[PDB]
């Protein structure tokens, strides 16, 4: 069963959970050849591995900007999860390391650009599109949840489609293994949910309500709480007002009354039947989750890739030049890394 | 329309994360 592949997965992920790889590779063996994307913490830049001549998405994140935005906890969460789990719709860390200044996260490159890119252009997804995507992060949160992990970042801009069109969730930076509740207050203002705003403390569950504004996003095209500045999107959210477009399925709106459901003892993957409230959802039931996992569905939009290493699928940013000091920076905050 | 509103608005680019 799904049990089954959840229990063999647990003990995979919990001996590299115990025993994390650490200084599998340094700078030099990589050629920078362009920044990907940019983030509130660091910059992704493709590379290509000169020996193997494969190219691979690395993570800069500098160790000093890490300690002045209080985020080493994170950043630390962020490397040892990732370099622990295994599932299809997740990317790949390869190698890790580190330098005098900055932290390195080499990781599978995905062509295909951002979920953002791709939905911004076409305005919106068709629903058996949306579907299609929904029904990857939801298999992918059962397995993440089922590791006592919650992810807390789920939003276009971290969610990858590689050549297949499927999906690579990307950024783990506030990952985190728990059982019982956490209280930090992080993640994208228009996914948070009603408890992290409120300062209440939370759980799993806040993954589910940010699946719930996924989808709602794909499918209209916008959000279903924005505004002009975060404190009047952390109102609407905390209001507990959806409005859905006259387009939604009667089926969509139903799935999403349950996960933007702002009481969260009656929300849609907090309950007794967990994930399951989902999966037998009358939306979700063309899909087959089995073949969705085994990558042997049809994907409705496979992007344009012209060889490798090229990067049309992603927005042209400004370079910075990677400067490493003579002197260690941060060196007992970030010695596990 | 709701559509037009959420172009016009200040958030249609990419959104980074928030902090303490
Ligand atoms: N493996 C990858 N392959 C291709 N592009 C990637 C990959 N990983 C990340 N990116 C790109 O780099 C961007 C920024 O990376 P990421 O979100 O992980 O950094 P960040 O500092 O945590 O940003 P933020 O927390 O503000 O979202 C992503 O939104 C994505 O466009
Ligand atoms: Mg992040």
Same mark, same amino acid.
């Given at each position: 069963?799904?049990?089954?592949?959840?229990?063999?997965?647990?003990? !995979?992920?919990? $001996?590299k959970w115990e025993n994390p790889a650490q200084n599998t590779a340094h700078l030099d063996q990589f050629e920078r050849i362009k920044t990907l994307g940019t983030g509130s913490f660091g910059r992704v830049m493709l590379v290509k591995?000169? #020996?193997?001549?494969?190219?691979y998405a690395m993570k800069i994140l500098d160790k000093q900007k890490v300690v002045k935005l209080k985020q080493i #906890?994170?950043?630390?969460? #962020?490397?040892?999860?990732?370099?622990?789990?295994?599932?299809?719709?997740?990317?790949?860390?390869?190698? +890790?390391?580190? !330098?005098?200044?900055?932290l390195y996260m080499v990781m599978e490159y995905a062509p295909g650009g951002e979920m953002f890119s791709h939905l911004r252009r076409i305005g919106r997804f068709s629903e058996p599109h949306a579907r299609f995507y929904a029904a990857q992060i939801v298999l992918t949160f059962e397995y993440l949840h089922s590791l006592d992990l919650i992810y807390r970042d789920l939003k276009p801009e971290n969610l990858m489609i590689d050549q297949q069109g499927y999906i690579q969730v990307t950024d783990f930076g506030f990952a985190k293994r728990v059982?019982?509740?956490?209280?930090?207050?992080?993640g994208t203002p228009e996914y948070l949910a009603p408890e992290i705003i409120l300062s209440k403390g939370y759980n799993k569950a806040v993954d589910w309500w940010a699946l719930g504004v996924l989808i709602y996003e794909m499918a209209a095209g916008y959000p279903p709480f924005f505004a002009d500045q975060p404190i009047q999107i952390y109102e609407k959210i905390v209001?507990?007002?959806?409005?859905?477009?006259?387009?939604? +399925?009667?089926?969509?709106?139903?799935?999403?009354?349950?996960?933007?459901?702002?009481?969260?003892? $009656?929300?849609?993957?907090?309950?007794?039947?967990?994930?399951n409230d989902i999966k037998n959802h009358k939306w979700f039931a063309t899909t087959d989750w089995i073949a969705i996992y085994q990558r042997k569905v049809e994907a409705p939009f496979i992007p344009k890739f012209k060889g490798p290493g090229?990067? +049309?699928?992603? !927005?042209d940013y400004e370079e910075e030049e990677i400067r490493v000091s003579i002197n260690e920076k941060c060196g007992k905050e970030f010695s596990e890394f | 329309t709701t559509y037009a509103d959420f172009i016009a608005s200040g958030r249609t680019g990419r959104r980074n994360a928030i902090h303490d």
């Open positions: 069963s799904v049990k089954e592949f959840l229990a063999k997965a647990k003990e !995979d992920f919990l $001996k591995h000169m #020996e193997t001549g494969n190219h #906890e994170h950043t630390l969460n #962020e490397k040892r999860i990732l370099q622990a789990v295994n599932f299809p719709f997740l990317v790949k860390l390869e190698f +890790s390391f580190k !330098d005098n200044s900055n059982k019982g509740r956490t209280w930090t207050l992080c209001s507990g007002k959806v409005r859905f477009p006259s387009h939604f +399925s009667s089926d969509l709106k139903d799935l999403l009354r349950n996960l933007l459901q702002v009481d969260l003892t $009656k929300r849609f993957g907090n309950l007794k039947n967990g994930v090229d990067t +049309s699928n992603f !927005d | -």
